[PDB]
């Protein structure tokens, strides 16, 4: 017997993703995490979207 995920994971656009989808026709998932790392000066994210 193996343990398997019981449900589909959920991917949600953040409101910044709404703004950039409308304006630039593009999305950067985890926009705020890129933002916070970039201003903090840190080069590595813990994981991807």
């Amino acid at each position: 017997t193996v343990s398997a995920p019981a449900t589909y994971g959920n991917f949600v656009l953040s409101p910044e993703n709404a703004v950039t989808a409308i304006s630039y026709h593009s999305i950067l998932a985890d926009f705020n995490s890129y933002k916070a790392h970039l201003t903090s000066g840190q080069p590595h994210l813990p994981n991807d979207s």
């Binding site: 949600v12 656009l13 409101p15 709404a18």
Partner: protein
């Protein structure tokens, strides 16, 4: 009326009745809504932001 000398003729007009008919002139103006507008107004997906 002005009462006048007995020899001068005159008239007996006390009132006259005059009828005015209303003149009709309707106005109109269109406004247009797209099928996409009606879809997003009416069929509110629960969906996302």
């Amino acid at each position: 009326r002005v009462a006048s000398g007995a020899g001068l003729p005159t008239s007996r007009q006390t009132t006259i009745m005059v009828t005015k008919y209303s003149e009709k002139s309707p106005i109109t103006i269109p406004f247009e809504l797209s099928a996409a507008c009606l879809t997003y107004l009416r069929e509110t997906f629960e969906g996302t932001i």
